[PDB]
């Protein structure tokens, strides 16, 4: 039952830098450790195994060592399409332990998201539902808190977000989060408000307005 | 060329079972040992199962112990993956991967992976019904329909059990939506209507959920 | 590539009675041919194979001959528990084909179905469903057919029906159909009707209610 | 007592897949030739899979043939039914029946079976997607969308006034509700300038469902 723990959790690079990922061991594990490339939604790429052995076909820029109980990925001369997460893997006869995995971004500076509130269309309520939107819209870096209050009572297992990949153009993300009320949930309160809480912002923003206008 | 795709990923509620296979093409099974791997949300790596050549050994995650069970079929190259007694945090991208290398050893690693497919356990393993009136209007028909519960079963009593004459419960029907309905009726006098009450009691035991609903005239 | 016809298709009889249910095939299976019986909701029960040959634990009351492509299973003596679905099957070593069944249910005299429609309720049109109910009451034989109009507008595919087994005191069934729609195709349309067709009707029967009256 | 017990019926879409399974107690599967059986709607059972001893043979109701597959587990007891690329016409009771008898022979009856679990087919393969506007109500730049709830399966495209308008958008990806549809939502930051003047149409397309739809959004 060998504890795998990587590090750093989140690696932030730019174009043509040379980073290395820590894999450490909770007890030695020899050689038996393999390395892997994913990209999101799309399934993970064996890189390397036995600690050092490049994987027929895999670019000689990834390269693998150590040994023990610590062990180093490094890419030298980071490539656009490298930008993914990497896992770790010890990896015995008949079973196998990750780490927590390392998500490897393109840096850039902190920018403060712009936050927008959406409340529900009419034609929606009129059918039985109301869905709140609350967009959080370029931001850097990717950890932020979104919280929902209805009438000042903190909401929880009745909103769903999605985070967009990193941008093309300006290396931020967007998020969007939904809250879903049944019609009379939604008719039996009025001020309806979001917080975001984020590095690149002094203090949260909270987005809020009232039913009905 | 290889390839590995899995099936029967879904939306299944807590304390459910599902089943998930994995076919290949462009090789054999038989010579490999067949691992299930899944990815949480947080986007970590978690290793599920593995199951051994001619199925001598079968290992799985504690996490998992207990509730799944992993089959091979090397005769039609397919692996299948048995949960049962789910849980919400087994909610993850599941991949079937293979065990290999361009020459097999006792120990390689994952070298080809299923594209996954998408298993979400929904936190609620119950819902209590909404009870809503089938309102009459000399042999009068009136009643409850049971709407929107789950799992079966519910019980239905007319003024705490003491009409008992006339009364018909149907059998459940499952709905498109995956929660159950069913309605409870009763034939009574024509002029009872206004003059003596008519409650319905709902007892749904899964959820510990009563229910009384008086059906008057409108 | 054997089919199997089974006969009569509804077989209605008296506690007491002798009944004999016949299954032909459509060419020679020797005596490869099984019994079971089947109570709704039940398990298949095997009560003979070998075409006469009884399983262990079946009461003596049922029997089983033919040969070739005639086969008979007999019922001496009518219980209440013999009341269920009969199924002829043959099996062959690696595969099997099953006759369409034959429903054994207790003979009354007909009687037409009480009918009667319900709205949806208010509560439930707020909550954006709106579920209308016809039930047949007290009614014999079980075939039946009902129809949903809107607006003279027959439906399909937005029904579903439930119906009870034969009842323990008078012998009859009753039967529950469930149109769903959303709020907007209920209120989008003023007349709702259901239209049974049964054995003891001299006619079809229609009941209909006009929506908010 | 000799028992079977079947896991995984549910809901499932048309053209969709789910899987069966089956475990025994009291008795180990390896000697019997194991078999899967429905009872449709009308009432009938309908023999719909057989696979032998060993695998050796596998055998199907023709109406099935290329769309099911039956496999064994021997070791731990378990018998497995795939069904792919399923039709309103599979949806039924099924049950997993043990061949056998007192003393085995070459060709035995189906001496035990499980209490069958339900397995049901909806009609309907696809749904197509509701649209519902993300009207603007800071600064230089206003915000706006559409909400696309309610559609299955993926994928679905969103476009802006044609295709004219993309510098700005942000199509996010899908998410799975726990009703079993998906939903998304699609935005544009604008100057604040333009509402009023300019008007703005999402144009989505579930190609899954030949379904489009053209929105126009607009304040308040």
């Known amino acids: 039952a060998v504890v795998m723990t990587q590090s750093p959790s989140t690696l932030s690079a730019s174009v043509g830098d040379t980073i290395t990922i820590t894999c450490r061991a909770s007890q030695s594990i020899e050689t038996w450790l393999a390395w892997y490339q994913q990209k999101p939604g799309k399934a993970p790429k064996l890189l390397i195994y036995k600690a050092s052995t490049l994987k027929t076909g895999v670019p000689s820029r990834f390269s693998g060592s150590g040994s023990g109980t610590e062990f180093t990925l490094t890419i030298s001369g980071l490539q656009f399409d490298d930008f993914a997460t990497?896992?770790?893997?010890?990896?015995?006869?008949?079973?196998?332990?990750?780490?927590?995995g390392t998500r490897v971004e393109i840096k850039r500076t902190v920018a403060a998201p712009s936050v927008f509130i959406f409340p529900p269309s009419d034609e929606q309520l009129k059918s039985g539902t109301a869905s709140v939107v609350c967009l959080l819209n370029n931001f850097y870096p990717r950890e932020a808190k979104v919280q929902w209050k209805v009438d000042n009572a903190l909401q929880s297992g009745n909103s769903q977000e999605s985070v967009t990949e990193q941008d093309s153009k300006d290396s931020t993300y967007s998020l969007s989060s939904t809250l879903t009320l049944s019609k009379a949930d939604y008719e039996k309160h009025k001020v309806y408000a979001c917080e975001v809480t984020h590095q690149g912002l002094s203090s949260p923003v909270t987005k809020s307005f009232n039913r009905g206008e | 060329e290889v390839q590995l795709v899995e099936s029967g990923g879904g939306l299944v509620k807590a304390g459910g079972s599902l089943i998930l296979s994995c076919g290949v093409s462009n090789f054999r099974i038989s010579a490999h040992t067949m691992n299930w791997v899944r990815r949480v949300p947080g986007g970590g790596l978690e290793w599920?199962?593995?199951?051994?050549?001619?199925?001598?050994?079968?290992?799985?995650?504690d996490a998992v112990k207990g509730r799944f069970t992993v089959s091979r079929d090397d005769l039609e190259d397919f692996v299948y993956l048995q949960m049962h007694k789910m849980r919400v945090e087994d909610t993850a991208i599941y991949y079937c991967a293979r065990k290999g290398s361009d020459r097999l050893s006792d120990n390689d690693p994952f070298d080809a992976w299923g594209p996954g497919t998408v298993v979400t356990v929904s936190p609620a393993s119950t819902k209590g019904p909404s009870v809503f009136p089938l309102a009459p209007s000399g042999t009068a028909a009136l009643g409850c329909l049971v709407k929107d519960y789950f799992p079966e079963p519910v019980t239905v009593s007319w003024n705490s059990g003491a009409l008992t004459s006339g009364v018909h419960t149907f059998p459940a029907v499952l709905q498109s939506s995956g929660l159950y309905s069913l309605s409870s009726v009763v034939t009574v006098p024509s002029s009872s209507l206004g003059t003596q009450t008519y409650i319905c009691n709902v007892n749904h035991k899964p959820s510990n959920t009563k229910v009384d609903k008086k059906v008057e005239p409108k | 590539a054997v089919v199997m016809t089974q006969s009569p298709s509804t077989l209605s009889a008296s506690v007491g009675d002798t009944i004999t249910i016949t299954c032909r095939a459509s060419q020679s299976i020797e005596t490869w041919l099984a019994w079971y019986q089947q109570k709704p909701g039940k398990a298949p029960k095997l009560l003979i194979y070998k075409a006469s040959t009884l399983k262990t634990g079946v009461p003596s009351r049922f029997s089983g001959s033919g040969s070739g492509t005639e086969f008979t299973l007999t019922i001496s003596g009518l219980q209440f528990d013999d009341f269920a679905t009969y199924h002829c099957?043959?099996?062959?070593?690696?595969?099997?084909?099953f006759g369409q069944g034959t429903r054994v249910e207790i003979k009354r005299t007909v009687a037409a179905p009480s009918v009667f429609i319900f709205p949806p309720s208010d509560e439930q049109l707020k909550s954006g469903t709106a579920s209308v109910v016809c039930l047949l009451n007290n009614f014999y034989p079980r075939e039946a057919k009902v129809q949903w109009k809107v607006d003279n507008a027959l439906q399909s595919g937005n029904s579903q029906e439930s119906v009870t087994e034969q009842d323990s005191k008078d012998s009859t069934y009753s039967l529950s159909s469930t149109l769903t729609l959303s709020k907007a195709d209920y209120e989008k349309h003023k007349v709702y009707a259901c239209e049974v067709t049964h054995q003891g009707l001299s006619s079809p029967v229609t009941k209909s209610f006009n929506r908010g009256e | 007592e000799v028992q079977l017990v079947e896991s995984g019926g549910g809901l499932v879409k048309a053209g969709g897949s789910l899987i069966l399974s089956c475990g025994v107690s009291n008795f180990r599967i390896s000697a019997h030739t194991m078999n899967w059986v429905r009872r449709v709607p009308g009432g009938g059972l309908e023999w719909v899979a057989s696979?032998?001893?060993?695998?050796?043979?596998?055998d199907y109701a023709d109406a099935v043939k290329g769309r099911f597959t039956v496999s064994r587990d021997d070791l731990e007891d378990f018998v497995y039914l795939q069904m792919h690329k399923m039709r309103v016409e599979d949806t039924a009771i099924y049950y997993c029946a043990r061949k056998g008898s007192d003393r085995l022979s070459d060709n035995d009856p189906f001496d035990a079976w499980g209490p069958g679990t339900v397995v049901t087919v909806s009609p309907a393969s696809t749904k197509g997607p509701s649209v519902f506007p993300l009207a603007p109500s800071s600064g230089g730049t206003a915000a706006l969308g559409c909400l696309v709830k309610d559609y299955f399966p993926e994928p679905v495209t969103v476009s802006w006034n044609s295709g004219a308008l993309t510098s700005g958008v942000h199509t996010f990806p899908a998410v799975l509700q726990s009703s079993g549809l998906y939903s998304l939502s699609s935005v544009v930051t604008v100057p604040s300038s333009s509402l009023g003047t300019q008007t703005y149409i999402c144009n989505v397309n579930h190609k899954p469902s030949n379904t489009k739809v053209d929105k126009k959004v607009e304040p308040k």
């Open positions: 696979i032998s001893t060993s695998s050796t043979y596998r």
């Open positions: 099957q043959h099996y062959a070593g690696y595969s099997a084909t």
